């Protein structure tokens with residue numbers, strides 16, 4: 001029984017895999033503050049978004065793939081590490097954290113320090129797309145080109161991997177948050193209705209699609225000019241029109257990456273195509289849209305919200321592998 005853990009420190013969700021057990025925590029990366037003092041973290045805090053009374057706020061400290069607020073991010077990480085601690089497990093926890101590939105040295109050090117402050121003995125860091133590819137089952141250690149597109153909340157990470165390293169990697173700030181924001185802006189312009197982020201995510205999941213048709217649902221929010229509650233209907237067709245711009249940006253980032261490939265690796269990617277992971281991979285039709293623009297097969301990973309955590313967990317379970325990650329960090 002171990003306290004070694006692997007943390008997918010996501011812009012939107014944090015997952016923790018614990019050695020010998022598997023995923024033991026999956027909660028939103030949200031912290032609620034009371035006037036400032038921490039009031040709630042995780043599942044309870046997300047439910048507060050857009051619903052807070054005076055003297056309270058709810059914050060996503062890792063929102064855009066960068067640390068927005070270092071103190072709040074540290075309290076969030078420590079809260080989750082403490083939550084999974086097993087008093088019957090061994091001590092001196094080894095911790096792997098998956099961080100955005102663009103994370104700077106300062107952010108990496110802050111993440112390291114947060115884990116040490118929560119009791120970690122040693123911390124190793126792995127970049128998002130490598131962990132995503134491992135957890136999606138791609139053969140990243142082989143001499144063959146594997147391409148992964150990980151659509152998260154604040155970012156999409158695109159990479160081509162071979163022989164345990166990176167051939168190409170780029171992230172852009174377009175993923176599920178920009179999809180939500182496009183839906184908010186759409187409702188404002190076309191229905192004079194102000195909606196919040198939770199309603200926007202609900203539209204996205206229930207009727208959002210990357211491909212115009214259709215079906216409709218009821219949406220409620222604040223009248224734009226006068227402020228009063230209002231209910232309106234929105235269709236798949238409207239949702240698809242709302243989402244076209246961020247979808248196109250994700251598709252462009254994928255296309256750009258392909259221009260970046262050595263011939264024999266291009267040959268491998270022509271063969272097997274592109275693997276999608278992350279929650280944004282669940283956007284209906286996004287696989288088809290990428291396929292149309294690239295000419296390549298597109299597969300959605302099994303359990304795409306969990307791939308990064310499963311991939312980190314795989315590394316954590318392999319002492320040789322883990323020792324190497326710790327060392328190169």
Ligand SMILES: Nc1ncnc2c1ncn2[C@@H]1O[C@H](COP(=O)(O)OP(=O)(O)O)[C@@H](O)[C@H]1O
Pocket residue numbers: 009010011012013014151152153154155175176177201204205208277278279280281282283284304305
């Ligand atoms: N069914 C769905 N359709 C579209 N987007 C979805 C769906 N389910 C989850 N998402 C989106 O996935 C994003 C979260 O993906 P995730 O990989 O957990 O991000 P991160 O690793 O950055 O925390 C959110 O924007 C969420 O709304």
Ligand SMILES: [Mg+2]
Pocket residue numbers: 010011128150152153278308
């Ligand atoms: Mg992620």
